[PDB]
Amino acid sequence: RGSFVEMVDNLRGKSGQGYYVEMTVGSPPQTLNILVDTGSSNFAVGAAPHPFLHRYYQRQLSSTYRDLRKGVYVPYTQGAWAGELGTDLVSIPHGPNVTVRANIAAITESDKFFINGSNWEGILGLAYAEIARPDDSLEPFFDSLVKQTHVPNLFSLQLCGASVGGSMIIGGIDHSLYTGSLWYTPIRREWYYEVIIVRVEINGQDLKMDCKEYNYDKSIVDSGTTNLRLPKKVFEAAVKSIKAASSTEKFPDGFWLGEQLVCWQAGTTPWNIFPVISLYLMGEVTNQSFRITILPQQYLRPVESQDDCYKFAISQSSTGTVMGAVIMEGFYVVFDRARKRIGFAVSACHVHDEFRTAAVEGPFVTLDMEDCGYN
Ligand SMILES: CC(C)CNC(=O)[C@H](C)NC[C@H](Cc1ccccc1)NC(=O)c1cc(C(=O)N[C@H](C)c2ccc(F)cc2)cc(N(C)S(C)(=O)=O)c1
């Protein structure tokens, strides 16, 4: 047992519909399951009945609730909600041993946001103030945590894929959650968790595109997004290469577009016929990079008997690269805000087989990496 042991295994997920942590709000206590989202910056909770919600926040029952008397609307790439701003006392029972007064958006209405059977009732936006709604004056939860307490300005995520689980370690790192070394990439700018991808490989074969393409118009680490999302040009090249590498079997075009599922008899999935995928990220030293490598076990996601049905979970984007659960489920990911960097190591819980494993390797030599970023 390490010092952060009480924060280990503090995440859950139902049928692969998002990773959530328990958060306790108000006085007396109201505990709710809250989606961990590194892709946004608002802390918001269901605050009225909804067909997909088992519980919700009841502000009338919280003595410590303070109304900010201001509405808020947050649209995501998927779904949207509207609500009312306030502040209240917040603790994470399997998180840090502190209690803070944080901004909280009470969700009163929503569209395609909550997910049937997911078992979560709110969202914890862990990114920076720049992308907070209504604006950057609304202090995000982690900012309040760091300002009000002595909790170090760092958190880390281990998302364990396939009911699923994992760990959110707040204020530090737990060594039981990874193997090998942690490799760090700079946070390019503090808004989203923006990174820079400098090279892409399918089964070790370079995709051979300008690195500007991989980061057009940004690349982000986003635990709230299921897929590995890629800019259109990059997605097209990637799929063409993955098909070529997996050519012993043929699949319909709709499979590669995520519109069609393919199922195998329970336990017989031919993982071996599908390629590994590597992303190279800018390192902490000049002209130095490293690479992270995922398996089909990460990018082919299981979907709801004696058949294992899978969705191809790499998809196209018009708003830059999104390194979502498909990436994060291979790795222990350290969000080192204090040092403006993100670390990756091989996850102790990542799904693999007897022939291949997810990997984090380096260093590599990559020139002109500062040119890869969109301006
Ligand atoms: C700055 C902000 C105003 C906006 N920020 C964003 O929209 C960023 C880019 N994404 C975070 C935003 C947060 C969110 C939306 C809706 C429900 C739950 C969470 N995510 C998406 O836009 C999004 C979600 C999802 C999603 O289904 N998420 C669930 C909860 C999930 C997460 C992790 C898992 F391992 C499994 C399931 C999917 C997408 N895609 C567009 S997709 C299909 O993965 O490519 C996009």
Q: How far apart are CA 367 and CA 309, in angstroms?
A: 42
Do the domain assignments include residue 135? yes
Distance of CA 112 from the midpoint of ligand 1 (Å)? 11
Backbone angles phi, psi at 91, to 5 degrees: -135, 160
CB 282 within 8 A of CB 289: yes
Q: Tokens 């690479």 identify what position?
A: 291
Same domain, 214 and 357: yes
Rg (CA), the chain: 20
Q: Which residues contact 368 (CB under 8 A, 6 or more apart)?
A: none
User: Which contacts (CB < 8 Å, 24+ apart) does range 135-142 have?
Assistant: 138/42, 138/72, 138/85, 138/103, 139/102, 139/103, 140/41, 140/42, 140/43, 140/103, 141/43, 141/90, 141/100, 141/102, 141/103, 142/337
Best mutation site among 53, 78, 191, 222 for ligand 1, i.e. most ligand atoms within 8 A of its Cβ? 78
Single-letter amino acid, residue 233? K
CA of 7 to the centre of ligand 1 (A): 24
316/228 Cα distance (integer angstroms)? 9
Same domain, 317 and 190: yes
For the question of residue 222 being annotated catalytic, the response is yes
* 79 Cβ neighbours under 8 A, 6+ residues apart: 110, 111, 112, 113, 114
Please state, in angstroms and rounded to a whole number, the distance separating the CA atoms of residues 106 and 266.
43
From 52, 74, 77, give the residue whose CB has the most ligand 1 atoms within 8 Å, as the site to mutate. Answer: 77
Within 8 A by CB and 6+ apart from 216, the residues are 231, 233, 320, 374
Domain end residue (candidates: 151, 169, 188): 151
Backbone angles phi, psi at 309, to 5 degrees: -100, 135
CA–CA gap between residue 129 and residue 132 (Å, rounded): 5
Residues with CB under 6 A from ligand 1: 16-19, 35, 37, 39-40, 74, 76-79, 113, 123, 131, 133, 222, 224-227, 229, 315, 324-325
Decide if 85 contacts 103 (C-beta within 8 A).
yes
| 258 lies in some domain | yes
How far is residue 234's CA from residue 237's CA, in Å, rounded to a whole number?
5
Same domain, 239 and 130: no
Q: How much distance in Å is there from the Cα of 226 to the middle of ligand 1?
A: 6
Q: In this structure, which amino acid lies at residue 269? A: T
264/289 Cα distance (integer angstroms): 38
What is the Å distance from ligand 1's center to 265 Cα? 30
Structural domain boundaries, residue 94: 19-151
Q: Are residues 93 and 201 in the same domain?
A: no
Residues 226 and 248 in one domain: yes
10 in a domain, yes or no? Answer: no
Q: Of the residues 9, 222, 308, 353, which is catalytic? A: 222
Choose the final residue of a domain: 133, 151, 169.
151
The token duo for 1 is 């047992």
What's 296's domain CATH number?
A: 2.40.70.10
Neighbours of 215 (CB within 10 A): 24
Count the domains in the chain.
Answer: 2
Quick one: resolution in A? 1.8
Largest Cα–Cα separation, the chain? 64
CA torsion, ordered 278, 166, 94, 35, to nearest 10 deg: 70
Q: Is the same domain home to 53 and 198?
A: no
- Given a contact cutoff of 8 angstroms between Cβ atoms, the answer to whether 365 and 280 are in contact is no
Is residue 12 a part of any domain in this protein? Answer: no
In the reported structure, the alpha carbon of residue 321 is separated from the centroid of ligand 1 by a whole-number distance in angstroms of: 13
Question: Which residue's alpha carbon is nearest to atom 28 within ligand 1?
Answer: 225
Is the domain of 207 the same as that of 139? Answer: no
Nearest atom in ligand 1 to 41's CA = 1
176 and 183 Cβ atoms separated by less than 8 Å: no
289 CA distance to ligand 1 centroid (A)? 28
Whether residue 192 contacts residue 267, with contact meaning beta carbons closer than 8 Å, is answered with no
Question: Judging by DSSP bridges, how do beta strands 155-160 and 331-336 pair with one another?
Answer: antiparallel
Atom of ligand 1 nearest to the CA of 77: 22
Count of other CB atoms within 10 angstroms of residue 159 = 27
Work out whether the CA dihedral 69, 43, 117, 115 comes out positive or negative.
positive
- Three-state SS for the chain is CCCCHHHCCCEEECCCCCCEEEEEECCCCEEEEEEEECCCCCEEEECCCCCCCCCCCCHHHCCCCEEEEEEEEEECCCCEEEEEEEEEEEECCCCCCCCEEEEEEEEEEEECCCCCCCCCCEEEECCCHHHCCCCCCCCCHHHHHHHHCCCCCCEEEEEECCCEEEEEEECCCCHHHEEEEEEEEECCCECCEECCEEEEEECCEECCCCHHHHCCCCEEECCCCCCEEEEHHHHHHHHHHHHHHCCCCCCCHHHHCCCCCEEEECCCCCHHHCCCEEEEEECCCCCEEEEEEECHHHHEEEECCCEEEEEECEEEECCCEEECHHHHCCEEEEEEHHHCEEEEEEECCCCCCCCCCCEEEEEEECCCHHHCCCC
Which residue, of 129, 151, 173, is where some domain finishes?
A: 151
Sign of CA dihedral 103, 341, 153, 5: positive
Residue nearest to atom 22 of ligand 1 (CA): 77
State in Å: Cα 38 to ligand 1 middle.
Answer: 10
What is the spatial distance between Cα 153 and Cα 171, in angstroms, rounded to a whole number?
6
Is the distance from CB of 178 to CB of 158 less than 8 angstroms?
yes
Candidate list 37, 88, 143, 174, residue with the active-site label: 37
Relative to the CA of 258, which ligand 1 atom is closest? 43
Nearest to 345 by CA among 151, 96, 214, 167: 167
Q: Is residue 119 part of a domain?
A: yes
Could you count the other beta carbons within 10 Å of the beta carbon of residue 96? 21
Atom 12 of ligand 1, residue of closest alpha carbon? 224
Instruction: Report the C-alpha gap between 225 and 42 in whole angstroms.
Output: 15
List C-alpha distances in Å: 324 to 26, 124, 143, 246, 278. 31, 15, 23, 23, 14
156 lies in the same domain as 284:
yes
Nearest residue CA, atom 40 of ligand 1?
A: 225
**Residue pair 77/113 in contact by the 8 Å Cβ criterion:** no
**Rounded Cα–Cα distance for residues 240 and 228 (Å):** 16
Query: Taking Cα atoms as reference points, which of 302, 306, 292, 305 lies closest to residue 345?
Result: 292
Query: Whose alpha carbon is nearest atom 6 of ligand 1?
Result: 76
